[PDB]
RNA sequence: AGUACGAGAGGACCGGGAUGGACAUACCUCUGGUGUACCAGUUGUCGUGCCAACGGCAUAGCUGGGUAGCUAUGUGUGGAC
């Protein structure tokens, strides 16, 4: 009938980072918070945050699996680049950053592992 | 401590615990073995005059169990600090 969320409230985002940076943990926490008033599977997951629809795609970090990053950045609108606090930008962080730049995807950086 | 290291794959030193193999030793409470003067079942035959009950011989006649002792495959202990 009528779409439950308008175009102005849609966010198609991908979580990308170097290996072990915390993409899966971040996605799990995001899903938990959006679902409270968690198994991560499938290409994309749909959730709601503050009246906004959020499609999340969690990407792999290894350079061996750059296909997933490519095929996700192709269809995504925004990206969250996760950085390990102790090491900052790492080689696969650079690789995913260049892929996002090639696809012209806006990015927000998130420094995870501040407690480490 | 998935820490140091490592692009990644992977992946520690040092330290702290648990639990084994093999070996040694003591020991029989347990699990089992043996257990020829323990209990019981049973065949053939000869006896105790006969019935009943018993004895001899047949590998301890054979068979099912089995005390102590002696025992391992069983139970403790050791090579720690
Ligand atoms: C985000 C996510 O879920 O990544 C998953 C999904 C993932 C990207 C996977 C790695 C790999 O198997 C991938 C390939 C390319 C494998 C070949 C084909 O089967 C294709 C169709 C297949 C597509 C995707 C797939 C299944 C993931 C992954 C990495 C696993 C980590 C390892 C560390 C050493 C051992 C491996 C992860 O957990 O990050
Ligand atoms: N100390 C700490 N560990 C984290 C944090 N986020 C994730 N981790 C852990 O670091 C590892 C990161 O792996 P994962 O989240 O799967 O990351 P991915 O490789 O980017 O998908 C896992 O062992 C997590 O438990 C964080 O903020 N702090
Ligand atoms: Mg992951
Ligand atoms: Mg004994
Ligand atoms: Mg005894
Ligand atoms: Mg005679
Ligand atoms: Mg008679
Ligand atoms: Mg004779």
Swiss-Prot record:
It is found in: Cytoplasm. Belongs to the TRAFAC class translation factor GTPase superfamily. Classic translation factor GTPase family. EF-G/EF-2 subfamily. Catalyzes the GTP-dependent ribosomal translocation step during translation elongation. During this step, the ribosome changes from the pre-translocational (PRE) to the post-translocational (POST) state as the newly formed A-site-bound peptidyl-tRNA and P-site-bound deacylated tRNA move to the P and E sites, respectively. Catalyzes the coordinated movement of the two tRNA molecules, the mRNA and conformational changes in the ribosome. It comes from Staphylococcus aureus (strain NCTC 8325 / PS 47). This is Elongation factor G. It comes from the Bacteria. The lineage of its organism: Bacteria, Bacillati, Bacillota, Bacilli, Bacillales. GTP binds at residues 17-24, 58-62, 112-115.
């Amino acid at each position: 009938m009528a779409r439950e969320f308008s175009l102005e409230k849609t966010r198609n985002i991908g979580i990308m980072a170097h290996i072990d940076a915390g993409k899966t943990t971040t996605t799990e926490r995001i899903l938990y918070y959006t679902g409270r008033i968690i198994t991560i599977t499938s290409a994309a997951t749909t959730a709601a945050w503050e009246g906004h629809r959020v499609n999340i795609i969690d990407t792999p970090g290894h350079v061996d699996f750059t296909v997933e990053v490519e095929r996700s950045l192709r269809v995504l609108d925004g990206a969250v680049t996760v950085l390990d606090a102790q090491s900052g930008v790492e080689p696969q962080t650079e690789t995913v950053w260049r892929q996002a730049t090639t696809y012209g995807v806006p990015r927000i950086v998130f420094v995870n592992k501040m407690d480490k």
